[PDB]
Amino acid sequence: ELVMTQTPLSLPVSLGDQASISCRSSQSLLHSNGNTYLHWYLQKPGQSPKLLIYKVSNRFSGVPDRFSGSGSGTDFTLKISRVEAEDLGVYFCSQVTHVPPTFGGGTKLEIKRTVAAPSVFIFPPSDEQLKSGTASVVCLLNNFYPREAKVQWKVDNALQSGNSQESVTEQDSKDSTYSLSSTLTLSKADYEKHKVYACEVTHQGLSSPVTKSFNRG
Amino acid sequence: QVQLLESGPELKKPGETVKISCKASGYTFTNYGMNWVKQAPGKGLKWMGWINTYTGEPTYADDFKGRFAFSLETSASTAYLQINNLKNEDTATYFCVQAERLRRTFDYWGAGTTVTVSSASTKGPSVFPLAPSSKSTSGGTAALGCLVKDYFPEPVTVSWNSGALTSGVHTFPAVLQSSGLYSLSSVVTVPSSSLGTQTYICNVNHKPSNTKVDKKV
Numbered sequence: 001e002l003v004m005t006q007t008p009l010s011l012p013v014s015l016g017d018q019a020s021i022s023c024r025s026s027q028s029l030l031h032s033n034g035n036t037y038l039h040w041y042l043q044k045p046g047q048s049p050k051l052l053i054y055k056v057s058n059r060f061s062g063v064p065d066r067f068s069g070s071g072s073g074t075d076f077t078l079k080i081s082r083v084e085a086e087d088l089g090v091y092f093c094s095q096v097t098h099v100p101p102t103f104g105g106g107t108k109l110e111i112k113r114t115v116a117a118p119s120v121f122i123f124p125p126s127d128e129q130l131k132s133g134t135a136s137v138v139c140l141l142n143n144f145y146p147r148e149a150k151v152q153w154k155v156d157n158a159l160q161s162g163n164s165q166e167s168v169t170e171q172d173s174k175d176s177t178y179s180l181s182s183t184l185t186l187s188k189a190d191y192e193k194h195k196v197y198a199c200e201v202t203h204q205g206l207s208s209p210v211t212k213s214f215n216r217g
Numbered sequence: 218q219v220q221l222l223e224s225g226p227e228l229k230k231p232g233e234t235v236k237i238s239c240k241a242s243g244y245t246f247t248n249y250g251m252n253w254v255k256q257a258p259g260k261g262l263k264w265m266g267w268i269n270t271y272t273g274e275p276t277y278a279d280d281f282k283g284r285f286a287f288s289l290e291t292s293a294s295t296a297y298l299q300i301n302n303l304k305n306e307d308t309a310t311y312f313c314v315q316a317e318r319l320r321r322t323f324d325y326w327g328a329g330t331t332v333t334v335s336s337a338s339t340k341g342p343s344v345f346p347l348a349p350s351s352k353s354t355s356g357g358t359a360a361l362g363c364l365v366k367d368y369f370p371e372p373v374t375v376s377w378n379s380g381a382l383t384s385g386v387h388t389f390p391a392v393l394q395s396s397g398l399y400s401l402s403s404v405v406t407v408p409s410s411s412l413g414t415q416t417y418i419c420n421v422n423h424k425p426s427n428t429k430v431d432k433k434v
């Protein structure tokens with residue numbers, strides 16, 4: 001099987017800095033006709049991929065000159081000079097020299113920016129939701145960086161475990177920050193057997209784990 | 218143009234059959250080969266083969282011989298992808314791609330058509346409000362959000378005030394609950410002074426069930 005191997009799966013880089021992505025194939029991509037069909041594609045968030053560089057080093061129409069590629073045989077490199085916010089997305093190589101064309105796993109370019117503590121808010125379950133049998137407590141971490149953030153739920157002051165799920169947005173294309181949302185779910189029944197519901201958030205941008213909680217329950 | 222019109226999302230139970238279409242603009246249809254690449258949930262791209270839009274000859278990737286069939290609709294500049302005897306493994310996004318012969322590039326990628334194979338049924342979501350602080354109605358910018366949960370399948374679209382609100386709005390990635398239903402939240406950052414004067418209603422939509430609700434927060 002022809003595998004394409006992109007070394008950096010995740011590539012954080014500061015705005016203005018250069019980024020380099022490497023793709024290494026298990027077979028030479030040089031064709032018996034002298035051509036080497038190694039292409040580079042970019043797949044921006046909530047979008048389909050767009051071709052950047054074709055046949056190793058050729059920039060496609062509409063592709064800025066900051067993008068360039070090099071390499072031969074089984075070793076190739078794509079380079080983004082002076083990275084911008086517009087560059088966020090997944091970069092993947094594609095070989096079309098052999099049998100079925102194949103692609104690389106991808107590389108997610110992340111924009112490095114100064115640390116930013118999140119603004120934490122907590123929302124208690126709704127009445128309409130309660131009057132239906134279940135309680136959903138939502139804790140929100142707005143605009144933070146880096147991504148790594150921990151959220152622990154405590155009810156009656158007991159560290160809840162196993163009853164919460166979270167989702168984090170894609171790196172914002174303006175401030176380069178992330179946003180997280182955590183939902184603790186209980187049955188109206190179990191939601192009644194306790195009073196204090198808190199979400200203990202701990203981020204690098206915080207001196208000491210901050211916590212938010214609501215009165216009733 | 219290179220414009221490609223993909224057909225809508227499909228939900229089906231195992232053993233059934235789907236047929237996705239892709240309409241290529243005029244003056245584009247016979248200037249490219251129409252390729253099909255699969256992208257299963259959290260998985261890499263996989264080339265399925267392609268169809269000759271000039272002769273009509275389909276070429277199938279070996280990992281795709283049997284249940285897949287490529288066909289054309291010449292007068293309509295349309296290509297079709299059919300999968301019969303569907304199974305969970307087919308759950309993925311199917312991309313229609315136009316490729317150029319000489320460079321062997323995947324020049325233009327379509328939006329992609331999702332196909333979900335499940336013996337579950339469509340379930341409209343419930344929209345509960347995420348009240349902007351029950352006792353904190355003052356303080357620069359406030360909470361404010363919308364919790365849409367227990368629906369299937371994906372996706373749901375969420376806009377604020379009919380597209381009026383775009384600032385601060387942060388819709389989160391759905392999360393799959395143990396129930397097998399999806400859940401997600403959409404929060405908006407607004408100024409505590411807007412609370413009272415400015416009305417806030419999140420408009421949700423779940424096309425797989427024709428659900429279209431709005432909820433005042």
Ligand SMILES: CC(=O)Nc1ccc(N2C(=O)[C@@H]3[C@H]4CC[C@](NC(=O)OCC(=O)O)(CC4)[C@@H]3C2=O)cc1
Binds near residue numbers: 247250317321
């Ligand atoms: C006018 C014009 O450009 N036509 C045209 C465009 C693309 C293709 N075409 C594809 O869309 C496929 C992809 C994948 C593989 C492909 N070539 C290939 O398999 O060549 C082997 C062969 O000679 O049959 C190149 C890009 C193959 C192909 O020839 C054929 C004719």
